[PDB]
């Protein structure tokens, strides 16, 4: 039956360079040569959130679409969603269009649907953003969306996450441990907003940045090219790999989930084009995971010609 | 107009000469909002005389206070285009390796770029 057809195997990769350079994706290393299926599966499994249209008016009389202004909010949703996926499903979990998915999957996705009731919907984010001094429809930067997600997570008793946003290029281990042992350890979502330069990222940070994607705890990075935010999930050689929210899709009407998965080899852009305003994220399920992450960070001192983007201090 | 545009090179050199002679244990620092930064407020003053023992961590805190910023608002202090390697680093050491030809140590503060499309 299938024998009389040409399955066009790897058609999706006709848009990817066949190099010996390993492909890193949120802490997993792949070989372009023998793991195209694995690479595509991991990328396609990630929850993808793009601009949406025709959803309930935000605040009753606000926008019914976030096209043109919700880009960083969408990138925030994607990195936080990946944290939820790791927390509820595990980093090893993979999505398949056919096979029935776990109920926890629909719960995670549901939390990002464009409706006021969902924990992390565009409605909840934009509205909570007002309290941070951001009007509905105003563009966000990395820290702002991170701060808004931390406040929204408070109400997510299902995930019961500890969200720490390290300011001033400093990660205080004492504060983090105190947070995770409060209300024995709450899975940790660590977000580090950074400004690696004025207009460009100093070459000195490049290798350190790459290594941020090579840790088991890696959630990726949010930032972008000027006027185009992206959720960076890894890299290959000198190019960052990412998911792009700049595509307007109809609000989902049931949940059919094909539109929340980017089933294509990821978009690429040279690391040289990345703007200096970013937020790096890490997920530490247990205290042991956090301790391992701390070790991962310290080991970076072994990077030749590289400089640290942030520093770990005890208190 | 930036500090360097309001005071001439020779004038700045002279400023430093006097201040260093009058306060040998203080570092003359110019701190301004990055020309590309528009979200963070501007300071009523741009010239600071900082005890040389003050570290970047403390400097970041006082400027945040001066700008009346909340702890969760993004703020970065950059020297010669880069972030502070270590926040425990004394301003005296930063001055030593990063000072301008005119004798002043320059710094600009900024938050983060925002994003959106079309």
Swiss-Prot record, chain A:
What InterPro entries does the database record attribute to this sequence? ATG4_LIR, Papain-like_cys_pep_sf, Peptidase_C54, Peptidase_C54_cat
Which cellular components does GO assign to this protein?
A: autophagosome membrane; cytoplasm; cytoplasmic vesicle; cytosol; endoplasmic reticulum; mitochondrion
**Outcome of mutating residue 71 to S, per the record?**
Complete loss of protease activity
User: EC number(s) of the enzyme?
Assistant: 3.4.22.-
> Where this protein primarily resides, as one coarse class?
cytoplasm
Per UniProt, which keywords does this protein have? Acetylation, Autophagy, Cytoplasm, Cytoplasmic vesicle, Disulfide bond, Endoplasmic reticulum, Glycoprotein, Hydrolase, Isopeptide bond, Mitochondrion, Phosphoprotein, Protease, Protein transport, S-nitrosylation, Thiol protease, Transport, Ubl conjugation, Ubl conjugation pathway
Q: What is the effect of changing residue 86 to S?
A: Does not affect formation of disulfide bonds
Catalytic activity line of the entry: [protein]-C-terminal L-amino acid-glycyl-phosphatidylethanolamide + H2O = [protein]-C-terminal L-amino acid-glycine + a 1,2-diacyl-sn-glycero-3-phosphoethanolamine; [protein]-C-terminal L-amino acid-glycyl-phosphatidylserine + H2O = [protein]-C-terminal L-amino acid-glycine + a 1,2-diacyl-sn-glycero-3-phospho-L-serine
Cite the effect that the entry attributes to residue 228 to A.
Decreased phosphorylation by AKT2
**Known consequence of changing residue 195 to A?**
Strongly reduced protease activity
Single GO molecular function: scaffold protein binding
The outcome of changing residue 267 to S is: Does not affect formation of disulfide bonds
Keyword Transmembrane on entry: no
Positions modified as Phosphoserine? 31, 277
Catalytic site: 71 (nucleophile), 244, 246
State the post-translational modifications: Phosphorylation at Ser-277 by ULK1 inhibits autophagy by decreasing both proteolytic activation and delipidation activities. Phosphorylation at Ser-277 is dephosphorylated by protein phosphatase 2A (PP2A). Phosphorylation at Ser-31 by AKT2 promotes its hydrolase activity, leading to increased proteolytic activation and delipidation of ATG8 family proteins.
Give the domain note: The LIR motif (LC3-interacting region) is required for the interaction with ATG8 family proteins MAP1LC3A, MAP1LC3B, MAP1LC3C and GABARAPL1. Required for proteolytic activation and delipidation of ATG8 proteins.
- By its UniProt entry, which PANTHER family does this protein fall under? CYSTEINE PROTEASE ATG4, CYSTEINE PROTEASE ATG4B
Role according to the record? Cysteine protease that plays a key role in autophagy by mediating both proteolytic activation and delipidation of ATG8 family proteins. Required for canonical autophagy (macroautophagy), non-canonical autophagy as well as for mitophagy. The protease activity is required for proteolytic activation of ATG8 family proteins: cleaves the C-terminal amino acid of ATG8 proteins MAP1LC3A, MAP1LC3B, MAP1LC3C, GABARAPL1, GABARAPL2 and GABARAP, to reveal a C-terminal glycine.
Q: What is this protein called?
A: Cysteine protease ATG4B
According to its UniProt entry, this protein's organism is Homo sapiens
This chain is encoded by the gene named: ATG4B
Swiss-Prot record, chain B:
Q: Where is the lipid attached (Phosphatidylserine amidated glycine)?
A: 116
The membrane-topology field of this record reads: Lipid-anchor
Report the locations given in the UniProt record: Cytoplasmic vesicle, Autophagosome membrane; Endomembrane system; Mitochondrion membrane; Cytoplasm, Cytoskeleton
- Function (record text): Ubiquitin-like modifier involved in formation of autophagosomal vacuoles (autophagosomes). Plays a role in mitophagy which contributes to regulate mitochondrial quantity and quality by eliminating the mitochondria to a basal level to fulfill cellular energy requirements and preventing excess ROS production.
User: In which organism is this protein found?
Assistant: Rattus norvegicus
Q: Describe, as the record does, how this protein assembles with itself and its partners.
A: 3 different light chains, LC1 (a cleavage product of MAP1B), LC2 (a cleavage product of MAP1A) and LC3 (produced by one of the MAP1LC3 genes), can associate with the MAP1A or MAP1B heavy chains. Interacts at microtubules with CABP1 (via EF-hands 1 and 2) but not with calmodulin. Interacts with FYCO1 (via C-terminus). Interacts with TP53INP1 and TP53INP2. Interacts with TBC1D25. Directly interacts with SQSTM1; this interaction leads to MAP1LC3B recruitment to inclusion bodies containing polyubiquitinated protein aggregates and to inclusion body degradation by autophagy. Interacts with ATG4B.
The primary site where this protein sits is: membrane
Gene Ontology CC terms = autolysosome; autophagosome; autophagosome membrane; axon; axoneme; cytoplasmic vesicle; dendrite; endomembrane system
Q: Where is the lipid attached (Phosphatidylethanolamine amidated glycine)?
A: 116
For the keyword Membrane, the answer is: yes
Positions of the record's site feature: Cleavage: 116-117
Regarding protein family, the annotation reads: Belongs to the ATG8 family.
Q: What does the entry's PTM section describe?
A: The precursor molecule is cleaved by ATG4 (ATG4A, ATG4B, ATG4C or ATG4D) to expose the glycine at the C-terminus and form the cytosolic form, LC3-I. The processed form is then activated by APG7L/ATG7, transferred to ATG3 and conjugated to phosphatidylethanolamine (PE) phospholipid to form the membrane-bound form, LC3-II. During non-canonical autophagy, the processed form is conjugated to phosphatidylserine (PS) phospholipid. ATG4 proteins also mediate the delipidation of PE-conjugated forms.
Tissue-level expression: Abundant only in neurons. Detected in testes.
Q: Offer one example of a GO biological process linked to this entry.
A: macroautophagy
Instruction: Specify the superkingdom.
Output: Eukaryota
Q: What is this protein called?
A: Microtubule-associated protein 1 light chain 3 beta
Q: Which GO terms describe its molecular function?
A: ceramide binding; microtubule binding; phosphatidylethanolamine binding; protein domain specific binding; tubulin binding; ubiquitin protein ligase binding
Per the UniProt record, the lineage of the source organism begins with: Eukaryota, Metazoa, Chordata, Craniata, Vertebrata
> What are the UniProt keywords, alphabetically?
Autophagy, Cytoplasm, Cytoplasmic vesicle, Cytoskeleton, Lipoprotein, Membrane, Microtubule, Mitochondrion, Phosphoprotein, Ubl conjugation, Ubl conjugation pathway
> Would the keyword Plastid be found if you checked this record's keyword annotation?
no
């Amino acid at each position: 039956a299938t024998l009389t057809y040409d399955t066009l195997r790897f058609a999706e990769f006709e848009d990817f360079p066949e190099t010996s350079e390993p492909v890193w994706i949120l802490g997993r290393k792949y070989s372009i040569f023998t793991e195209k299926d694995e690479i595509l599966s991991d990328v396609a499994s990630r929850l993808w959130f793009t601009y949406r249209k025709n959803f309930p008016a935000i605040g009753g009389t606000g926008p019914t679409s976030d096209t043109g202004w919700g880009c960083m909010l969408r990138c925030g949703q994607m990195i936080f969603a990946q944290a939820l996926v790791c927390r509820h499903l595990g980093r090893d979990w993979r999505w398949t269009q056919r096979k029935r998915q776990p109920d926890s999957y629909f719960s995670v996705l549901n939390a990002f649907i464009d409706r006021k009731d969902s924990y992390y919907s565009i409605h909840q984010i934009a509205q909570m953003g007002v309290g941070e001094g951001k009007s509905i429809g105003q563009w966000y930067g990395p820290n702002t969306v991170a701060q808004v997600l931390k406040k929204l997570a408070v109400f997510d008793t299902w995930s019961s996450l500890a969200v720490h946003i390290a300011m001033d290029n400093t990660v205080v281990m004492e504060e983090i441990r105190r947070l995770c042992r409060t209300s024995p350890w709450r899975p940790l979502v660590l977000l580090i907003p950074l400004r690696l330069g004025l207009t460009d990222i100093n070459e000195a940070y490049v290798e350190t940045l790459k290594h941020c994607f090579m840790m088991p705890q890696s959630l990726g990075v949010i930032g972008g090219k000027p006027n185009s935010a992206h959720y960076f999930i890894g890299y290959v050689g000198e190019e960052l790999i990412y998911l792009d929210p700049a595509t307007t899709q109809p609000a989902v009407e049931p949940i059919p989930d094909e539109s929340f998965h980017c089933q294509h080899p990821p978009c690429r852009m040279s690391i040289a084009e990345l703007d200096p305003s970013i937020a790096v994220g890490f997920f530490c399920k247990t205290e042991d995971d956090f301790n391992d992450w701390c070790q991962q960070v310290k080991k970076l001192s072994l990077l030749g010609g590289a400089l640290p983007m942030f520093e770990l201090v005890e208190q | 107009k930036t500090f360097k545009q309001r005071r001439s090179f020779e004038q700045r050199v002279e400023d430093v000469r006097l201040i260093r002679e009058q306060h040998p244990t203080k570092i003359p620092v110019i701190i301004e909002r990055y020309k590309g930064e528009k979200q963070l407020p501007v300071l009523d003053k741009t010239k600071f005389l900082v005890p040389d023992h003050v570290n970047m961590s403390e400097l970041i805190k006082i400027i945040r206070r001066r700008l009346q910023l909340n702890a969760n608002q993004a703020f970065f202090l950059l020297v010669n285009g880069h972030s502070m390697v270590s926040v425990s680093t004394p301003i005296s050491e930063v001055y030593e390796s990063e000072r301008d030809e005119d004798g002043f140590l320059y710094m600009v503060y900024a938050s983060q770029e925002t994003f959106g499309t079309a």
